Amino acid sequence: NIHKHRILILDFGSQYTQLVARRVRELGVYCELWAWDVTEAQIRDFNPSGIILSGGPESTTESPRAPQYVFEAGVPVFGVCYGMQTMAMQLGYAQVEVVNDSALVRGIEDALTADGKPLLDVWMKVTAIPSDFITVASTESCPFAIMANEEKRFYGVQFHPEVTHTRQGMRMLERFVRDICQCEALWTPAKIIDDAVARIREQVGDDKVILGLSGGVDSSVTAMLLHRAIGKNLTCVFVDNGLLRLNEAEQVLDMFGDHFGLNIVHVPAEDRFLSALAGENDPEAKRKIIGRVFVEVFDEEALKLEDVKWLAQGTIYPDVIESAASKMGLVEPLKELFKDEVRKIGLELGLPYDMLYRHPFPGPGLGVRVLGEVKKEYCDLLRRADAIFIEELRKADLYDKVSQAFTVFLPVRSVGVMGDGRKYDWVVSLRAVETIDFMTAHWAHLPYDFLGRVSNRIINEVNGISRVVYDISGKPPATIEWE
Amino acid sequence: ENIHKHRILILDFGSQYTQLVARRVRELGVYCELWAWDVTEAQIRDFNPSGIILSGSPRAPQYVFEAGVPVFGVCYGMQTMAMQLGGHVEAGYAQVEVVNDSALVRGIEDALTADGKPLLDVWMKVTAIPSDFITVASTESCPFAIMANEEKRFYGVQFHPEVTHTRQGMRMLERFVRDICQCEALWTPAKIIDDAVARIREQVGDDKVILGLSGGVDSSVTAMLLHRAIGKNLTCVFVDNGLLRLNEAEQVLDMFGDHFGLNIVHVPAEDRFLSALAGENDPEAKRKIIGRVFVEVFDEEALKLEDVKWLAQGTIYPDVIESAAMGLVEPLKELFKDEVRKIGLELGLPYDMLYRHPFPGPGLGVRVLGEVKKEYCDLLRRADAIFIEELRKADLYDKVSQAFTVFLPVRSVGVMGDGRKYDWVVSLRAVETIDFMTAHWAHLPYDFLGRVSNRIINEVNGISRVVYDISGKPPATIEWE
């Protein structure tokens, strides 16, 4: 069983904790990210084959600490940054000299040299280890780079193995998870899919399941999962909310109605969304509106069915994790998956690459990209602008060099040449970013020649657009979307 | 000493480069005028040129060749020179081989051929030259790249010598205007100033003159010329319309009031222009209001002054050329824009001010899209200041023709400590201008753009997001309105 060998990752608040989880996932082992403030009851219920304590911005000199069971549970424990500093007490690029044999790092040598010692290229106080620990690696600024009670199988590392900059970090996480915690590598996209199917089948039986099909990654893979498990019993509602991209409805239907043979209720709700949105300039109002009409449309569509006892949903593990930060049943095949696993299993389920590695598209769609009041003519204009932008972006092989690209409609009038020189028309902003984390994203240094080709195209080819600007504001101090 | 004694008639055959040719002639210190090609024997005879230039189916007046003065045809001018004297015409860097001796290019060599023959590096068609002309230079594509009737002192070149791409073009221009045409170079900043003062004094005498002092290049140099000519008898009216750059009023007042001793009437009229603009969204109406309120204010101040008999004005020669179908002092009406700067330097004005990017008459009124409001103008001024501050630090101010900031009355979200706040967006706009019809948006460095947008969003309370106008002209325009 694929959840059997499982890592409990305890989050002391690093931005890299989910990266550790994703690395364990990549290594083929289930794992779970909980907050540090967990009860020995819970760790005993999860029953981890090993524990991992993640980095932290706090300090053990105040203060987040592991539930003492972490070290009493008799499973190998791996501390990382804070997780190492908290393992003690409770018991930029750099190179560490391996000063001892440890289970964790034996055989793993990036450079050696030192003339008589193994070196580790790692990506990086602890004044003294517990009495049962040895020093395993050391640096100038950190004599305690790796510490280990190799008998109790506790390991401590002042660097981040989950990050690629740690030359052999993954081999180290492999060592801890596969070899020191003797975990089998059962958590494979093929076997996740079988687990998904089995669990949906068992949880829903012959009951009818409904699902909001966006065409996006999460609800698509969910569609494919539900569909593989209960076939025709699944009904997907595709709402064209009048806020999608150019031809999005066609593409979602060509893909999932035709190509994959899904049972699709197609709801053309453009006028209805644009109705409810009428005269609404407040971006948070628009979101709530757009989100409410969606819930309205699905509940209407659900009733037109019958015996629909289950709503399916593209909830992925990160979503569960924020919810962790404090009618119809829920079918959530992806609740345990991170986004890269979802894509990977989407590939195995047969979905196309393009869709799976597409830029995220917001729920509210163009509703948050038409500044202020959302009008059809602004959305049609926005659509042709985005289409050109994204089509040029794809020609130039720039689509994968940015996390997200789109255009924003500015309801301001600017003059542009018409032939005699007298036509005001609308302005759009191109927006392209390289996303670093949920808090920070850089605006993309798209090439000048390229920007200008897109500019000219949008202005010349779209009647109603006279001027194109580029969002040159990063996040912070701005955000990715304009609303 | 008439600095207009030696003069060059340049006939404009519609080329972009014709005002370039005239400026080159003015750079050699020789006065010249640029007329439309369609002139009369009479119009030309009255000018009495020391030499005629024809720029790049229109035809020169037959008198141009009858006039007995040297004539220089460039591109279309050389082609039209061939047509009209019995030749024949049929329609990038290049090198023309000089194949005959000619006053125009005698001694002007850029390289030598393998044969050992002279070559000209030029920037650029005739198939038969008149029977009294010879072939001066040629190249593979252009059999007749330079031709000359050495006797009538007629010279045609297919390339443009006014463009520095023609390696020694200026020297051929110098050769025709100074040697062939027999011109002294008295047209100098210092002497143009003297002649401007002389002509102002003679036309105005002891009368008091009034002047609209916009702070721009033209009205400033006009102000300094008048102040030099008539001093206390000059009142400049400076009108802060509410649409000027940050501290423009203080700056113009500092400069001409305290520093230069001009007599200034400062009209703080921000509320007045803003109020005449309240609610107006149409840029055509905004400009008309701003212009309308401008003369109203200026008229109300001209009636506030005893014995004002003359209006001074920074009309420059291109304004005169562009104009092609109380007394008026226009000291700059013969000067091209760079000449006006050169003399503004000799009159003691500051370089920064003379080479400043042009600012439009309505100012921020065409840069706050829609209803111009004080709030938006305030934000715009701060953002714009940060932009130019940085442009100058980066030595990029020199590198664009115009750089400014447009206020977009759209709300965008941005970070506000731990959460979010909606505020206004501005667009940076920077162009390299090419002509009245053509401008490329500047490829400002990315790092620089990032600094500026950070500076604006972080430093300007009320701005959350900054975009860069990446639209060229055409299909867009330089200004947003």
Added chain:
Amino acid sequence: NIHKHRILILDFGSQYTQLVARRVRELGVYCELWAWDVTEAQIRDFNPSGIILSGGPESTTEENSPRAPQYVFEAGVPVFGVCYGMQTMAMQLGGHVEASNFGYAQVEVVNDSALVRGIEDALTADGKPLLDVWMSVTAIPSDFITVASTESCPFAIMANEEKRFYGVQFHPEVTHTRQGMRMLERFVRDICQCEALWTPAKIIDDAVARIREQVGDDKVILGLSGGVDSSVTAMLLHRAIGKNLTCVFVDNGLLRLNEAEQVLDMFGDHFGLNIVHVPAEDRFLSALAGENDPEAKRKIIGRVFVEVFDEEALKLEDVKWLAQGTIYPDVIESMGLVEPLKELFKDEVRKIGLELGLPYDMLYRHPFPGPGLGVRVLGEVKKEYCDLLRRADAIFIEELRKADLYDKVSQAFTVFLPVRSVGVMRKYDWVVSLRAVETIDFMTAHWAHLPYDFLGRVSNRIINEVNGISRVVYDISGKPPATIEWE
């Protein structure tokens, strides 16, 4: 057994054929790359779980052109034809090719096949599956179905599902084929039903087992160069027969700075190997004395090293085995012989070297030629020239690594130029040349467009810091018309 599931890959002459092989290896499945001109007895003896017929430049329309042995299609195993492999399978099975004396291409999947079922990169506006492939046939066999199409290429993919014959006109082995690896995975793991036992941990365990069966308690001589193959080899025999393995490391005086100290400290003082160290600097130098001919120097360096190695070998009799780092590419291009790496490709040797415990930086270090500095010192090889070269090269590589440029080139090194150049406090000293290449194939190398300020930095460090070097130049000559080494 980790060779049980195995893919026979027949080589029809493509450049990318070794890449097909290594992708099967990357997949976790043993495979073998043979010339196409083999026999049924050979295939039968090999017992493929599946056969891949790879690309090739020749035309199927020519007179005596390559054909797959007819048994390929009678082995009752799956057959995968890639490009010419597919053109030969179509021609050998009833269909036709027209001849025509590369590119990115999107092929539309127009029918189901086990090979590309569910492998999609995009949809057409008409809902049809698209594959992003690295492209390169007028009729297919009449038991074959068309699987995918292009404009240019009507039969991009053909297949006989019953017989498990799949032909593609693109290169799944090339990363440009977006889901190439998946199709190869599909063929090998799903269709050929191979397990992924070909792993580094298991290839090591296999290596050890096969050394012990072959050698037992016998004694084994090895030439330890510190290079990648000789060293992983040493680790395998050592993990296999400990003290019964002896490593002869000859410091020929033509090695990089402190190479002897480093080879010895690492494999003797850290991996507990038993190494006889021939400190043979003066002997190689004496032999090379007065030889300005690169060909003659290569010989001389070869001759002496054999002489030295033989002498050290005789000195430990009752040794019946010479071990050697020969790797699978050596096999493909070509006391008793022990060769643990003879089935491994270079990146496997590296991968298993990491499992053996070896340092990354050593396993991914640039190749250092047999003659070492004997061929990087133009003309007469002298102690002093090698000495300057070693200091110069050490500076170059040190800068090159801290600039994170070692990853970015195939080979970086310094060549000593016996020419005098003026420099400042005015002195005449030697010239060295930096040389850094990006090696496309065996015959093509681009000189690296190393940053200018980096080049200027390396260049100043070498001049200022190496007493004896007045001037640094950079080889801006690619292969062809020049070669990688200078001699």
Added chain:
Amino acid sequence: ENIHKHRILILDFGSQYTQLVARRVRELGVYCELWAWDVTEAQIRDFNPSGIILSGGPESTTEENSPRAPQYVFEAGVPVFGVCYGMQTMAMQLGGHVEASFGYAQVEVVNDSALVRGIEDALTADGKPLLDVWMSHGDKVTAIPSDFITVASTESCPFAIMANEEKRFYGVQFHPEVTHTRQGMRMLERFVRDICQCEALWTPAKIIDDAVARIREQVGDDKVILGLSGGVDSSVTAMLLHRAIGKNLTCVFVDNGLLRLNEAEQVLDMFGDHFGLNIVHVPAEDRFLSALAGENDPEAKRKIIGRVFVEVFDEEALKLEDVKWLAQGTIYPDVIESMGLVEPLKELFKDEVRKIGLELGLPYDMLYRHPFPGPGLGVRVLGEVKKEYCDLLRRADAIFIEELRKADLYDKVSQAFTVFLPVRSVGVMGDGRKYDWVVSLRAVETIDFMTAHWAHLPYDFLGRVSNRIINEVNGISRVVYDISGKPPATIEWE
């Protein structure tokens, strides 16, 4: 016409920018001489400057033996302009005081001075005039002499400009001669044309006319020989003498086998078949190669080439009866660095030589060619000079320059050439290999006599040239690029 009548004395205190001052004043149309600071009142009285400019320098007036102007500088009754050090020694030598301590800066003008009245680059917010100047942040005047006034200042430079308006003494802590001082030229012109009242009679056309007249009055109708090398200096000298004494000028062009590809023909085609000079063309390639045979020492090679050049020239001289005059192209920098002698360019800087060269009819690209050393390929062929090597180098170099001109990179460098390395490398030949010579491309952006940076030529450009030389020149296996700056290396390899 006396075109030297007005003249500025520049006293060199050692600034890297002193030559620039001299050329700016020249550019303004006013003759000027550049002397060392330690000259004598006597010498200055002889020159009789219309005005004196004291340049900057690296020394410090606060140090014991620091350079000072001849006191007469301040007693000659002419305007004195002091630039940095010259300002600081003007202060100190007049009762000021300097304290011991380059960049852009804005000096605020605070008093009227003939030097900068009307010269303004910006204003302060407070509305006060600013000059944009290129300053030396080093030593600073902290007291100005009694009858001086502060003209300009910064928060860090109380006396950024000082002036004694009556004595026409001006000191600036910045460099008006460098472009980075926005209106420095106008400052220099203000001093030279206005305050010193120099007429701008030092123009190319007038310099020519003056040279001619000085030639025609030094030699009259005598015969004059001239080593013509096609280099800028002797070419301009040749044309001066041609216009001056015409037929009596005999030009000797020596092809020493160390010239660039076809150089003899293009020099012959140019100055013989086109400009009409009388060229005695000596083909002495075998004579130089012979004398050079077996000489691997670059210092010996240079002496040999020098010596052998002189014998050839003396012989050609002997073949002409009554050669009473030797013309050379010595330019003023050669004087500053240091048969009757005619040196028409001894007062001219290199740009002035080009400028008058163009006025004489010489082609631009010749006048602006990179400097070619006197020994030619003999110091670009490393070790022993042989014809096979020079033929190679010539072919290789001409490819180099041809491409360099094509890509508009020729004028982006001060010198570009190829060095023949007597080292052999292997290369591809067909399917097998070949073994042939190596050449080095060498290209520099020269900043001064002691500083050259190697050019960041475009990689694709380098590889194109690379391939061309190797694929087009027989005898070359490989091309390298010199990536050594000067210092620690030199421009030439030998």
